[PDB]
Design an enzyme around this catalytic site. Structure first.
Site, PDB file in Angstrom:
ATOM      1  N   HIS A  41     -75.941  37.011  54.297  1.00 48.52           N
ATOM      2  CA  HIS A  41     -74.687  37.597  53.868  1.00 48.52           C
ATOM      3  C   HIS A  41     -74.438  38.986  54.461  1.00 48.52           C
ATOM      4  CE1 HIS A  41     -76.124  40.411  50.734  1.00 48.52           C
ATOM      5  NE2 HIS A  41     -76.703  39.453  50.037  1.00 48.52           N
ATOM      6  N   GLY A 143     -76.684  47.678  48.257  1.00 46.82           N
ATOM      7  CA  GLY A 143     -77.419  48.110  49.420  1.00 46.82           C
ATOM      8  C   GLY A 143     -78.904  47.761  49.412  1.00 46.82           C
ATOM      9  N   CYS A 145     -80.142  44.709  49.069  1.00 46.65           N
ATOM     10  CA  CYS A 145     -80.411  43.375  49.539  1.00 46.65           C
ATOM     11  C   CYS A 145     -81.278  43.461  50.777  1.00 46.65           C
ATOM     12  CB  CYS A 145     -79.130  42.641  49.864  1.00 46.65           C
ATOM     13  SG  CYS A 145     -78.206  42.255  48.357  1.00 46.65           S
TER      14      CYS A 145
HETATM   15  O1  LIG Z   1     -70.584  40.909  47.842  1.00 44.33           O
HETATM   16  C1  LIG Z   1     -70.969  41.273  46.749  1.00 44.33           C
HETATM   17  N1  LIG Z   1     -71.157  42.701  46.464  1.00 44.33           N
HETATM   18  C2  LIG Z   1     -70.860  43.814  47.515  1.00 44.33           C
HETATM   19  C3  LIG Z   1     -71.906  43.975  48.725  1.00 44.33           C
HETATM   20  O2  LIG Z   1     -72.860  44.748  48.603  1.00 44.33           O
HETATM   21  N2  LIG Z   1     -71.799  43.264  49.958  1.00 44.33           N
HETATM   22  C4  LIG Z   1     -70.691  42.255  50.238  1.00 44.33           C
HETATM   23  C5  LIG Z   1     -70.579  41.901  51.729  1.00 44.33           C
HETATM   24  C6  LIG Z   1     -71.777  41.107  52.076  1.00 44.33           C
HETATM   25  C7  LIG Z   1     -72.983  41.975  51.849  1.00 44.33           C
HETATM   26  C8  LIG Z   1     -72.827  43.301  51.013  1.00 44.33           C
HETATM   27  N3  LIG Z   1     -71.206  40.227  45.799  1.00 44.33           N
HETATM   28  C9  LIG Z   1     -71.618  40.320  44.430  1.00 44.33           C
HETATM   29  C10 LIG Z   1     -72.280  41.434  43.874  1.00 44.33           C
HETATM   30  C11 LIG Z   1     -72.659  41.503  42.533  1.00 44.33           C
HETATM   31  C12 LIG Z   1     -72.339  40.446  41.689  1.00 44.33           C
HETATM   32  N4  LIG Z   1     -72.646  40.334  40.277  1.00 44.33           N
HETATM   33  N5  LIG Z   1     -72.224  39.256  39.793  1.00 44.33           N
HETATM   34  S1  LIG Z   1     -71.373  38.188  40.944  1.00 44.33           S
HETATM   35  C13 LIG Z   1     -71.633  39.311  42.214  1.00 44.33           C
HETATM   36  C14 LIG Z   1     -71.275  39.262  43.554  1.00 44.33           C
END
Ligand SMILES: O=C(NCC(=O)N1CCCCC1)Nc1ccc2nnsc2c1
Ligand SMILES: O=C(NCC(=O)N1CCCCC1)Nc1ccc2nnsc2c1
Ligand SMILES: [Cl-]
EC number: 3.4.19.12
Lengths: 306, 306
Positions: A41, A143, A145
Site C-alpha cells: 500500500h 507512518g 507501516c
Molecule cells: O490509508 C489509510 N490511512 C492513511 C495512510 O497512512 N496512508 C494511505 C496511503 C497508503 C499508505 C499510507 N487507511 C486507514 C488507516 C486507519 C484506519 N483505521 N480504521 S480503517 C483505516 C484505514
C-alpha cells in the site's frame, strides 16, 4: 529477581530499517541482502485504499518511482515485484548490516518484539503477541507501516510480522514477510471487525510459574483439577482450551518449581472465579497472557544472543 | 492507536557492552571511547561482599588482572582507577561504535530503558523508572551487574544507571555512571531496606491523558478539584504530592486534549477512592506510574532517533 515485559535487543533490526516513498506515501522498509521489503500500500493514495486494485496501480510504477533511503544515503532500485501484500524492491547494494535471518509465520499465542519506526528511523521497541483472533495490540501511528516484529535465537533474527493496518477498533493487523496477512484481514479501508479476543491460557499459566519463581505465591491453593474440568471454566471466561500439548510445554516450569501443571490450573481456576481481591501478581492487577513458556524460562535463565 | 511500555532502540548501547572478569567474577562493562566502566565489586569474592574494603582489595589488582572482552576479541587494559563505586578501565583501543553520549544523574520519577546483559552479551530491553525510594523494579539475575540504563535524545545516549545490587526484597539498586548510588544504598551484602514505594502522581496523570487520546474515557467525570484538596487524597494513598511544577509539565497534554489538569486530578481522585470497579485503562487493571509526560507525548507523536 523481578519480571518485566522484555523485548529482544533491537540493534540487528535497526540496521535493516529504511524509508520507502512512492509518489506521495512514505513508510518503512526492511533491507535484507539486496532486497527491500515493504507494504504494497505504499503505492496507494489515501483515496485508493477504499477499493485498491494493486496490480492495476502497480502498472503505473517503475523502479525509479520507489525512493529508498537508508539513513542519509539513497539506494538504487533495479527491480520490483509484488508478492501477496508486500513489495520486494531489488536494490544494487546488499545491506552490509544484514544479520543472520529467517522468515517465520508464527502461530497465535506466540510473542515477538516490535521495532516501531517512522520515516525509516527507529522510535522504540516493545513486546507483542499474536492474538487468537489474529490481531496484535501494538502502538502504531501514521507512518509506522512497514515496522517489523521479530524474535532472536542465538544470532539469527526470525522475522514474523510486518505492520500494515490499524482497524477502526484501534488494534493492528499485518502480514508475515511473505506478505500473507495474519487472519482474515485485508489491506483495504473497509469494515473488518476483530473476533473474540480470547486469552492465551498456556501463557497465563507460564506467567503464574514466573510469579512463583519470584516469590509471588499467595494464589497457590490446596486444590487440583483435570483438563476437562478446567476447560469448562476456560470456556466461560473466554480462555483458550488447554490441551495436553500445552501441558507438555509447561513441563520444564513444572519440574523447576515442583508444582504440577494441573495444580497450577486449579489456582488459575480460583483466580478466574473469585478475582484477585485487589491483590497483584508480578506487578499486575490482571492475568497476563503475553509471556510464553519459553519467554519465562529465558528471562528466568539469562539467555543471551551474540 | 495503542499504548505500550516502550523502550528505546538498544543498538547504540549494544555496541558498547563488554565482559569484565577479575579473578573469579564476571559481569558487564560499558565501553565508551577508550574507557570501560563497570561495578567495582567485580574485584570481590562472594565472601568479600559482607564487609569489603575496596581500596585494600584494589591494591592486589593490576591492569592485567582485568580481563575485558568485546564479543570474541580481547581488549588491552593500560590503566585503572576507582571513582566512587565504579571502576574505570583504560584500554588501548577506542570503541569504534561509541555513540554520541552523556552521563546524567536522573531524578526520582524519571524513566529509562535497561539493556539487560550477561557475560557481555545483550539479553533483552525493557522500561524502568527511578522510584521515589531510589530503587528500580527491574529484571536482573546473577551476572547482570554492569548492565546500564539510558535514554536517547536525537542521536545522543544519556546514560543514567549502572546495575550493582539486588536487595533482599527483590528490587534493585545501582549507580549513575560516576559511580554514586541512587539513594542510600551501598555495594555491601547487608541489611538495607527500601523506604515507602510511593506512586509517581504526575506520571499517572500523564498516562490518564494517554488513555484519553486513545479512546479510554470512562473515568472522566463531571468534577474538578484543587492542588491542596487533591493532595489530601494523594497522601492517604501514598502518592507523591502534586506541585505547580507538575501541573506546568502537564500543560502540553492538557492543551492537546482540552482537559484541565485539575479536572484530570479529580478523575484520578475518584479512581483512588472508588477503584476501577473491575474495568481497565490502556490494558491495565491498576494505575500506571512509569510513563512520564514526555514519554506520553513521544509515543503519541512518533519521535524518532537517528
Ligand atoms: O490509508 C489509510 N490511512 C492513511 C495512510 O497512512 N496512508 C494511505 C496511503 C497508503 C499508505 C499510507 N487507511 C486507514 C488507516 C486507519 C484506519 N483505521 N480504521 S480503517 C483505516 C484505514
Ligand atoms: O555478592 C553477591 N552475590 C553473588 C555475585 O554475583 N557476585 C559476588 C562477587 C562480587 C560480584 C559477583 N551479593 C548479593 C546478591 C544478592 C543479594 N540480595 N540481597 S543481599 C544480596 C547480596
Ligand atoms: Cl495491571
Amino acid at each position: 529477581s523481578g519480571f518485566r515485559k522484555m523485548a529482544f535487543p533491537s540493534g540487528k533490526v535497526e540496521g535493516c530499517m529504511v524509508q520507502v516513498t512512492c509518489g506521495t506515501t512514505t513508510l518503512n522498509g526492511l533491507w535484507l541482502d539486496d532486497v527491500v521489503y515493504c507494504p504494497r500500500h505504499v503505492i496507494c493514495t489515501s483515496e485508493d485504499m477504499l477499493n485498491p486494485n494493486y496490480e492495476d496501480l502497480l502498472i503505473r510504477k517503475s523502479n525509479h518511482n520507489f525512493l529508498v533511503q537508508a539513513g542519509n544515503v539513497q539506494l538504487r532500485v533495479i527491480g520490483h515485484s509484488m508478492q501477496n501484500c508486500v513489495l520486494k524492491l531489488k536494490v544494487d547494494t546488499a545491506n552490509p548490516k544484514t544479520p543472520k535471518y529467517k522468515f517465520v509465520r508464527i502461530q497465535p499465542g506466540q510473542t515477538f518484539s516490535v521495532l516501531a519506526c517512522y520515516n525509516g528511523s527507529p522510535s522504540g521497541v516493545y513486546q507483542c503477541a499474536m492474538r487468537p483472533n489474529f490481531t496484535i495490540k501494538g502502538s502504531f501511528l501514521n507512518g509506522s507501516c512497514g515496522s517489523v516484529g521479530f524474535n532472536i535465537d542465538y544470532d539469527c533474527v526470525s522475522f514474523c510480522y510486518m505492520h500494515h493496518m490499524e482497524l477502526p477498533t484501534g488494534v493492528h493487523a499485518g502480514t508475515d514477510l511473505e506478505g500473507n496477512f495474519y487472519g482474515p484481514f485485508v489491506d483495504r479501508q473497509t469494515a473488518q471487525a476483530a473476533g473474540t479476543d480470547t486469552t492465551i491460557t498456556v501463557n497465563v499459566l507460564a506467567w503464574l510459574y514466573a510469579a512463583v519463581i519470584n516469590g509471588d505465591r499467595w494464589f497457590l491453593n490446596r486444590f487440583t483439577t483435570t483438563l476437562n474440568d478446567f476447560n469448562l471454566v476456560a470456556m466461560k471466561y473466554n480462555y483458550e482450551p488447554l490441551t495436553q500439548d500445552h501441558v507438555d510445554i509447561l513441563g520444564p516450569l513444572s519440574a523447576q518449581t515442583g508444582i504440577a501443571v494441573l495444580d497450577m490450573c486449579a489456582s488459575l481456576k480460583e483466580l478466574l472465579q473469585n478475582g484477585m481481591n485487589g491483590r497483584t501478581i508480578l506487578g499486575s492487577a490482571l492475568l497476563e497472557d503475553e509471556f510464553t513458556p519459553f519467554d519465562v524460562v529465558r528471562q528466568c535463565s539469562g539467555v543471551t544472543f551474540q
